Amino acid sequence: HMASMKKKGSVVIVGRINLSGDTAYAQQTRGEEGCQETSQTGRDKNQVEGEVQIVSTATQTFLATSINGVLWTVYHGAGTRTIASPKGPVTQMYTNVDKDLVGWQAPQGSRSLTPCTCGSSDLYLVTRHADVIPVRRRGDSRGSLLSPRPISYLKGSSGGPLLCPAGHAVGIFRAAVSTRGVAKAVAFIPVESLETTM
């Protein structure tokens, strides 16, 4: 009934992938209980830091990556949801279901990656466990893992970055090509597609 219809909660930042020093490591900044409460109100007062955020809904958890002042993630994780912020829910400024892409304004305190113009095919994928996986670019939006591993290790890392040797953002992790449960290649949203969407 109309009086009963509920509203989906906001995406909530629950942690980050720390790439500050020489050792990548995941940090949690908000627990389950706090995440639930923040998703309902859309009011997140936590300080935000870094380029790669760990984000959650009531049912999913994935990554979001800041590039050129926009926090990017995948549509199949975020849908059309708002993101929580200190002043309330923030509406998406980019939504493209054909690209599996959404974006909000980068939160205050975050840092943005620079789009890559190197043209290099030696990439690095950052997972939600702070694993840095070498990936060879095989096309406009595909890349192969130098060391294949079960898809279990990539699950929950959509929205994470593929980086060039210089640490520029080359793309956003979107999907995994699996053979008998082994991820041999990944699909990503090229940064050029982000720059065109912008």
Ligand X SMILES: COc1ccc2nc(C)c(O[C@@H]3C[C@H]4C(=O)N[C@]5(C(=O)NS(=O)(=O)C6(C)CC6)C[C@H]5/C=C\CCCCC[C@H](NC(=O)O[C@@H]5C[C@@H]6C[C@@H]6C5)C(=O)N4C3)nc2c1
Active site residue 171: no
For residue 142, the number of C-alpha atoms closer than 13 Å in the C-beta half-sphere is 7
SS3 of 66-118:
EECCEEEECHHHHCCCCECECCCCECCCEEECCCCEEEEECCCCCCCECECCC
How far is the C-alpha of 59 from the C-alpha of 93, rounded, in Å? 23
137 binds Zn ion (CB under 5 A): no
77 near ligand X (CB under 6 A):
yes
x/- letters, 126..145, toward ligand X (CB under 6 A):
--------------------
Q: 168 labelled as ligand-binding?
A: yes
Nearest to 177 by CA among 147, 153, 142, 146: 142
Q: How many degrees, rounded to 5, is the angle at CA 60 between CA 89 and CA 129?
A: 105
Stretch that binds ligand X, among 2-10, 28-36, 105-113, 151-159 (CB under 6 A): 151-159
From ligand X, Zn ion, none, which one binds at residue 168 (CB under 5 to 8 Å depending on kind)?
Zn ion
Among 25-33, 41-49, 76-84, 166-174, the segment contacting Zn ion (CB under 5 A)? 166-174
**Residue 118 sits in the site that holds Zn ion (CB under 5 A):** yes
The site for ligand X (CB under 6 A) is made up of 60, 62, 75-77, 97, 100, 151, 154-158, 173-178, 187
Residues labelled as active-site residues: 76, 100, 156, 158
